[PDB]
């Protein structure tokens, strides 16, 4: 059906259809939520979550892929106490993809081992991963997820159940999925840079009952390039198609 | 290897 | 800094010292050291489902000590309990993991 | 400024 | 004492085998890397890691064994200025067991002491076997990670996420382990040639801060003896089973 | 004939006469004298979780030493430290420490 920019007389464009926003857990998106549990391994979640979410998006396949197969061995990351996102999926274009759910759980890392050439089934990736802040102005013009970074002012996990505005943490501490952007109202202006009703929905790896029931809305501009919290620094898009 | 006929469940 | 990790150590302010006293209740029913109260002068903090503190406390003849706890997430009272025991480990183990 | 800069007439 | 005269016989004796890439670390068997730190003790890590490995590769019950019930309990080895995995193995086959890592802690270069009756843990070996220089791409595959020794250059100590294309030491004065091997499809820096370079996955007793998680990778090929630093001269392994 | 340890002695490179110069920066532990840096003689080396370059030196009324110095691993900043030092020895009696 015919949804958006269509020349009808004389002028045209370049797939620049709205310059507006709607959220992408509602229009084909999102996978379930998960608890991190005396382990800080959020790289794992965001990273392997993007593989699984791009599955449910690109193909209507719906894989609820595991997290203790890059946190039982990614011998290029430094444990449940370390790991990056700069290269947290580049260890699944060499592993065959990570082994999956309903035949393997996450188990909190009481000092443990790998079980990787044990399974008959695997689901992995083909393409690479890097979203520039020059693709986070249209952020989800892919119709699919992103793996940006968030710093926490520790006035973050404060179960605001809502929105947070402010100058965030100090270093890109935690890893956060991008479940989309929302657009509530547009600027209600002040002397300079007035009230932001516009919002940014982002999933998290902390818990399932936290804020917007596992998610956190924050405060973007018309575009997405004038926030704080340093989001747009480490964005990556793991694809298989 | 263990591919179709070998695996248990 | 590291997603899931941290950066260097920060100057010991009294709030990690209150986390200290909660750790010491836990520490004495299964530690040979019939324990008590200590003195905290180093730490590091992490981004977990919680805040995964480490407490450098001084003890013993001339060795020093180290521990782990987490200010839980603001579910209910943040009622921190353990997640690590490495007793009388020196001030020079680079703030360890237990 | 160039995401759909339809400048001119 | 004993050797590959009647021991390999059952595994890759009566049977021949084959592979190009087999790591006992992505295979539910190897245990954590740790440190030595200014005390002349590199041998302790190799031995205790070795016994951890085989218990978990056989009856898959993990142990973290201790290197302070060794370094100061040496009865025939030297101590915190040097030591010999050949005989640290055997000092263990006269005691009765090695304390678990956290049933007897570790200090650094600082003058501590030794007790063996602060344990009831009987984590021991019935005997051990001696592994030749030549068979070391098939010694870490059926018989387990062999507690090798290496050389030290001042190039060696500097790591990154790559294979060693640098020079080496002026003598073989160190002790490490060998876990496995593999093959990696690559390009030519000048061509578009099908260059496939082989490696050796070894552990280390330097920090788990090291790029590939206390697993540093050096030059060896399908021959088994392209060693650029002499990886396999001292390489014997213990026999819990 | 040992895997992992010390190695029998060696004459000299002046880039372990850079670590001898750092002796005065890493003293005022128990030094007790006025010697405003010690002058070196011979060389020795160890290879552990760092390059623990060994070196000896001189003093006031000509009594030498056998130290247990330590450089850094490829880690954090420029630190050179003192592990174990001693004095009141002869030039023929050489470097030790266990
Ligand atoms: Na299915
Ligand atoms: Na790359
Ligand atoms: Na395969
Ligand atoms: Na605060
Ligand atoms: Na609107
Ligand atoms: Na301004
Ligand atoms: Na940037
Ligand atoms: Na069967
Ligand atoms: Na407080
Ligand atoms: Na007890
Ligand atoms: Na008392
Ligand atoms: Na506990
Ligand atoms: Na105009
Ligand atoms: Na016209
Ligand atoms: Na013989
Ligand atoms: Na026999
Ligand atoms: Na005996
Ligand atoms: Na060199
Ligand atoms: Na060098
Ligand atoms: Na670097
Ligand atoms: Na060359
Ligand atoms: Na050529
Ligand atoms: Na050339
Ligand atoms: Na000689
Ligand atoms: Na020079
Ligand atoms: Na000078
Ligand atoms: Na005199
Ligand atoms: Na001694």
Give exposure, F26-47, as e/b (b: 16+ Cβ within 10 Å): bbeeeeeeeeeebebbbbbbbb
Phi, psi angles (nearest 5°) of residue E108: 175, -155
> Quick one: three-class SS letters along chain A?
CCCCCCCCCCCCCCCCCCCCCCECCCCCCCCCCCCCCCCCCHHHHHHHHHHHHHHHHHCCCCCCCCCCCCCCCCCCCCCCCCCCCCCCCCCCCCCCCCCCCCCCCCCCCCCCCCECCCCCCCCCCCCCCCECCCCCCCCCCCCCCECCEECCCCCCCCCCCCECCCCCCCCCCEECCECECCCCCCCECCCCCCECCCCEEEECCCCCCCECCCEEEECCCCCCCCCCCCCCCCECCCCCC
Residue E204's CATH number? 3.90.70.10
List the resolution, Å. Answer: 3.3
Q: Centre a 10 Å sphere on the Cβ of residue E112 and count the other Cβ atoms it contains.
A: 14
Q: Where are the domains of chain C?
A: 6-84
Residues of chain F found within 8 Å of residue E84, distances taken between Cβ atoms: 2-3
Q: How far apart are CA A213 and CA A208, in angstroms?
A: 6
Q: How far apart are CA C17 and CA A221, in angstroms?
A: 41
Sign of the alpha-carbon torsion through F84, F87, F91, F93: negative
Number of folded domains that form chain E: 1
Q: How far apart are CA C26 and CA A84, in angstroms?
A: 33
Experimental technique used to determine this entry: X-ray
Q: Do E62 and A116 touch (CB under 8 A)?
A: no
Q: How far apart are CA C18 and CA C47, in angstroms?
A: 20
Residue A81 and residue C5 in contact, taking contact as beta carbons nearer than 8 Å: yes
Three-class secondary structure of residue C42 per DSSP: strand
Pick the CATH number of C6-84 from 1.20.120.420, 3.10.180.10, 3.10.450.10, 3.40.50.720: 3.10.450.10
> Subunits that touch chain E (at least 3 Cβ pairs < 8 angstroms)?
A, C, F
Instruction: Provide the pairing of β-strand C53-57 with E127-130.
Output: unpaired
Q: How far apart are CA F47 and CA F4, in angstroms?
A: 7
Which residues keep their CB under 5 angstroms from ion ligand 28? Answer: F 98
> In chain F, after which residues is the C-to-N distance over 2.5 Å, breaking the chain?
none
DSSP string over F25-79: GG--SS--S--SS--EEEEE-BEESEE--EEEE--SSS-B-----B---SSSSS-
Tokens 């956290």, residue?
A: E102
Closest alpha carbon within chain C to A171: C1
Q: Do C5 and A37 touch (CB under 8 A)?
A: no
- Residue E32 near chain C (CB below 8 Å): no
Q: Which structure tokens are listed for A200? A: 């940014």
Residues linked to residue C50 through DSSP beta bridges, in sequence order: C48
Q: Can you give the residue range of the structural domain that contains A99?
A: 4-240
Which residues are CB-contacts of A137 (< 8 A; sequence separation ≥ 6)?
A223, A224, A225, D3
Ligand nearest to the CA of E1: 15
Going from the Cα of C14 to the center of ligand 9, the distance in angstroms, rounded, reads 7
- Our CA dihedral for E106, E107, E112, E117, rounded to 10 degrees, sits at -20
Q: How far apart are CA C73 and CA C71, in angstroms?
A: 6
Which residues are CB-contacts of E204 (< 8 A; sequence separation ≥ 6)?
E33, E176, E210, E214, E215, E216
Q: Could you tell me the CA-to-CA distances from F82 to E25, E39, F93 in Å, in that order?
A: 38, 13, 21
- Our CA dihedral for A109, A113, A117, A119, rounded to 10 degrees, sits at -40
Q: How far apart are CA E194 and CA A7, in angstroms?
A: 50
Residue A231 and residue A137 in contact, taking contact as beta carbons nearer than 8 Å: no
Q: How far apart are CA E68 and CA E53, in angstroms?
A: 18
Q: With 0-12 CB in 10 A as exposed, 13-18 as middle and 19+ as buried, what is F69?
A: buried
Q: How far apart are CA F25 and CA F44, in angstroms?
A: 20
Residue E97 and residue E123 in contact, taking contact as beta carbons nearer than 8 Å: yes
Q: Which structure tokens are listed for E14? A: 């009566």
Give the residue among C48, E180, E99, E60 at the shortest CA–CA distance from A113.
Answer: E60
Residue A60 and residue A53 in contact, taking contact as beta carbons nearer than 8 Å: no
Beta strands in chain C (DSSP E): 40-44, 53-57, 65-69, 85-86
User: Which among E28, E209, E212 is the nearest to A75, CB-wise?
Assistant: E212
Give the residue among A40, A35, A175, A208 at the shortest CA–CA distance from C48.
Answer: A40
Q: Which structure tokens are listed for A74? A: 């990614």
Secondary structure of chain C: what % helix, strand, coil (to 5)?
15, 20, 65
Q: Could you tell me the CA-to-CA distances from A141 to A15, A48, A59, A189, A207 in Å, in that order?
A: 9, 21, 17, 27, 28
């Amino acid at each position: 059906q015919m949804n958006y920019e269509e020349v009808i007389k004389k002028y045209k464009g370049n797939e620049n259809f709205d310059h507006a926003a709607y959220d992408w857990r509602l229009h084909s998106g999102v996978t379930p939520v998960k608890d991190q549990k005396n382990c800080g391994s959020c790289w794992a979640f965001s990273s392997i979550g993007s593989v699984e979410s791009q599955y449910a998006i690109r193909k209507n396949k719906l894989i609820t892929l595991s997290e203790q197969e890059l946190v039982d061995c990614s011998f290029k990351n430094y444990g449940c106490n370390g790991g990056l996102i700069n290269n947290a999926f580049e260890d699944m274009i060499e592993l065959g993809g990570i082994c999956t759910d309903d035949d393997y759980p996450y188990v909190s890392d009481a000092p443990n081992l790998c079980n990787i050439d044990r399974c008959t089934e695997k689901y992995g990736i083909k393409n690479y991963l890097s979203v520039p802040d020059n693709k986070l102005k249209e952020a989800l013009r892919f119709l699919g997820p992103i793996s940006i970074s968030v710093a926490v002012s520790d006035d973050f996990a404060f179960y605001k159940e809502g929105i947070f505005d402010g100058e965030c943490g100090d270093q890109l501490n935690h890893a956060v999925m991008l479940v989309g952007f929302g657009m509530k109202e547009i600027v209600n202006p002040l002397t300079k840079k007035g009230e932001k009703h516009y919002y940014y929905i982002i999933k998290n790896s902390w818990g399932q009952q936290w804020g917007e029931r596992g998610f956190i809305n924050i405060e973007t501009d018309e575009s997405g390039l004038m926030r704080k919290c340093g989001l747009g620094t480490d964005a990556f898009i793991p694809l298989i198609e | 290897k263990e591919i179709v006929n070998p695996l248990t469940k | 800094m590291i997603p899931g990790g941290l950066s260097e150590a920060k100057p010991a302010t009294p709030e990690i010292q209150e986390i200290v006293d909660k750790v010491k209740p836990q520490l004495e029913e299964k530690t040979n050291e019939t324990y008590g109260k200590l003195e905290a002068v180093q730490y590091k903090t992490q981004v977990v489902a919680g805040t995964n503190y480490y407490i450098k406390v001084r003890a013993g003849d001339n060795k020093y000590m180290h521990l782990r706890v987490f200010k839980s997430l603001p579910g209910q009272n943040e009622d921190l309990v353990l997640t690590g025991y490495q007793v009388d480990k020196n001030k020079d183990d680079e703030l360890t993991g237990f | 400024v160039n995401p759909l800069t339809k400048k001119g007439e």
